[PDB]
Amino acid sequence: PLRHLRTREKRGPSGCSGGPNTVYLQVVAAGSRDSGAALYVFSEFNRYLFNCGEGVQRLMQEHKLKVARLDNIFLTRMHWSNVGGLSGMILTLKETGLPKCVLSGPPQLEKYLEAIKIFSGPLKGIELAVRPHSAPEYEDETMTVYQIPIHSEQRDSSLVVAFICKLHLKRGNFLVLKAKEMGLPVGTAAIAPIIAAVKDGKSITHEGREILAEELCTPPDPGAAFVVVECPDESFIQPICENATFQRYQGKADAPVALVVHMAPASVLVDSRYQQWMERFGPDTQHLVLNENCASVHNLRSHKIQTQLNLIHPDIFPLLTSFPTLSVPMVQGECLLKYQLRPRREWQRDAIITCNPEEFIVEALQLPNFQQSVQEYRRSAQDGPAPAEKRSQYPEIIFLGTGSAIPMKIRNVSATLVNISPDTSLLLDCGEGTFGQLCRHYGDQVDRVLGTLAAVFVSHLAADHHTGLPSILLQRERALASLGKPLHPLLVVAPNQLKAWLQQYHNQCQEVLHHISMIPAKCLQEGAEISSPAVERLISSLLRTCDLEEFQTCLVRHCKHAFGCALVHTSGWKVVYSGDTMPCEALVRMGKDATLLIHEATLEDGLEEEAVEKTHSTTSQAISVGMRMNAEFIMLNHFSQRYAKVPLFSPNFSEKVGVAFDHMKVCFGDFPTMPKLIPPLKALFAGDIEEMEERREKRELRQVR
Amino acid sequence: AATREFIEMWRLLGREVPEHITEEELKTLMECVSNTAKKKYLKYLYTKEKVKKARQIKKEMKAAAREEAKNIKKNFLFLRLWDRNMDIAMGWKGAQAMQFGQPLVFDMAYENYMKRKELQNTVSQLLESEGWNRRNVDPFHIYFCNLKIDGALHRELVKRYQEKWDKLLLTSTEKSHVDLFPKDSIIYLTADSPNVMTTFRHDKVYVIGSFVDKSMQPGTSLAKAKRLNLATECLPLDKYLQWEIGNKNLTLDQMIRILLCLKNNGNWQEALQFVPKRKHTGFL
RNA sequence: UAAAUAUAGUUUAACCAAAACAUCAGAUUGUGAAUCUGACAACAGAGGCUUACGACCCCUUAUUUACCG
């Protein structure tokens, strides 16, 4: 149903009679640690994506970069930093109805695709054809892609794929005006096919003079070429420099390369052997670098919204924090940076997003009732009664994600961080891009947080709550190495079936299970069976390391093998977290007199019938469970796309209920302050609220009809 | 002017270009500061000739058709003078409307938001809108508020009406509608209003903003109403029509014909007859 | 979020290419004024391309439909 494939014959056999008119190369991920490295190539007839990293889908949708037109996704390495988040991408591609998507890279994506099918639904509707580097040259209506496998000197963890792309020759413009003096009938449908010959350049006999058509046609573009190459570390510099195929494109003068993107860290570029490599391409070849040295913002809307909420309460809404001359000139990658390849080779810096905070605050006060409500709240709380019950600063709940299934400009998929103590923490859920949220929330302190991460809990095998787990492990190993702490396996509490995906990935894609000490969620239940002794001393580690008096679990009402949670501390406070699920009585029995309850509040009031159809709750049911919980405070998250920016405020909203946002800190000493944050909240979100009330009304008209 | 440096091969190039151009037309050509804008204007300027000659060719072809039949091939009560008599009758009705008729206001404060194409089109809808008021059984008292005397909109109205401008039975003024009428009785009609118009009120002054934004600019009329303290209403198009196609902002000639039908005790079924049928699939 | 669409008087037709009905000014009309002489003719909007075009490609606004392992 997409216009891209329905309007196929209009595109033409050899493009639009030869080549696309405009082709540029846009960067969606400049190489930052949180956002990864990714590249986007735009053409008239095709659209390509390189190195689909974790959270890339969020950036491509937020920057109005269409996803329903992608043809091939090229991956330069069989590594989670490069392949992670592709599972979300194919689900998005399936949603759009795109029939066939071609994957390229190492021959291991055959096993990767079968690996991700353990959790993701059999991707019915979309064709996934993996085209390895051993496959022949991939030719398209726009461009030709060359795949070169590069092996390090030391499944296969030493394989890196580099792409030498090549734009097809574009047929030049036709000097139609000069053809009159020669005698050509410019009139439509009057010896028109000569123009096709003029495009081809072949001679045609006209006015008694058969001339070579290139005389009446502009010199055709030979086709600029660009190279996508990734050098993960030191051990890949030498094989790349001595690669025979590369010599065919740099030493020759007949095949210049317009641009070379370098997905390599700083240490690789400064190396002398690599340094000689870029200059060997020639002074004409521009060089683009995407690595951690990039200093730019990607999730502009997340930064924009965070600054505005920071006015209401700085502590509850902390501000997001961002994480040697060279012989060969090079241009640092930036978000939305463009380099047109046709018809002009130039650095298009116009579309680069700017992150100026001052505008975001300025936008806030010009809102109708925001400034009054924020000022009114500030005097009532700061200069009013005692600021809540005098309790410790710990534990503090970090809401890294409040998204129901797919990431959105404002909210990412579900991920909650619990800081039990300053030296220990645990993750209640790890959705896609969770590390990106972790890195953005703490900046230079992300490594310290990862060093204190002791355990990870996964609610259900649904991908929104666990697909980001691998990305943590590699970052945690790097973070632990930076801090010098010994490398020890992480504690993961999840259903037994989670090992199936991990075992498939470890034995086929990349070694990651050596960081994992998985404790099945079944043995955590009350009155559970005594399991194998190997698990038994692990359960002692869970309580000891996280300083938990007790850690309980039960089966919540959802898809088979779905589990809730309950944290009990030696101090006495009890935190109960419930994954996706309708009101469950087993959950009620679990966390009686819980200190804090985190519950799913996906739908509105009045959508109970699809709430059961989707095994998902509404706000009122979640609130009613909280009263049945007899819990001190109630936390709502896991909001659906319909609550894109803000949860709707039901009249049942009492002092014991509260709403959650991304990068929002909640402590036990903030409980009575949470209801006081509501009056400022709709004030800033006022234009958004009126959109929800009308769309709630539109469904009523459908019901009335 | 050197602007001929584009036309004199754009004809030979194969694009549709008119043959007769003047300096006045040539001047407006150079304000088009892009290739597409110039192409779009030239396409409009070309099709002006295309329908002119086609209708031109039609009319003297008819002249030969009738002159052959006209040349080859009693008790009355009235002389055939009806077009004169109808104009006089509408004049007496318009004079009465200017004294006791319900005021209707067309807001002319949108000159700064309109391009030349849109501003010219506004006059065309204004001409038709005032024409339907004249022919009605119970005409409004039409006001042209915020109409600057030297402004571009006023000059176009004078050019179209020529001599009739000084003789129209409507009150054109520089002052705003808030200066002429109590701010309580003013209801600024706009499609973006959150309040749905339920019934036609005969003790109220309805304001229609004479704005034709083919480059649609939502909220412009609402901003003016909320810049003052005027109340707003919107037509119940969703209530009575099954919308499928097109913008919900109707033209000025459709709006006045809907209001006239409502003022004459017509129901919403008859009043919404004037909403183009291409935009909905029947009244419900 | 995606796909379909978008006629500024109204319909029809559409790669036909312009109609039909309307609108404004002038008219002392001998009962076809059923006319004549003029005014206005922009298929959402802003840009790209192309020898071109209403085609093709981004973008903006809007409308109707659908919208999560």
Ligand SMILES: Nc1nc2c(ncn2[C@@H]2O[C@H](COP(=O)(O)OP(=O)(O)OP(=O)(O)O)[C@@H](O)[C@H]2O)c(=O)[nH]1
């Ligand atoms: N699936 C789906 N998504 C929707 C729907 N309505 C809105 N959205 C989502 O909400 C987004 C809103 O886009 P914008 O209007 O640009 O978002 P915004 O946050 O209001 O930003 P500004 O326009 O700059 O004010 C859409 O792009 C979608 O991602 C809907 O009906 N379905």
Ligand SMILES: Nc1ncnc2c1ncn2[C@@H]1O[C@H](CSCC[C@H](N)C(=O)O)[C@@H](O)[C@H]1O
């Ligand atoms: N559906 C509707 N209900 C009430 N008034 C309407 C209407 N549609 C158009 N109008 C009136 O017709 C005039 C021209 S429509 C243009 C409105 C303006 N450009 C905007 O975007 O808001 C307006 O002044 C408006 O008052």
Ligand SMILES: [Zn+2]
């Ligand atoms: Zn979920």
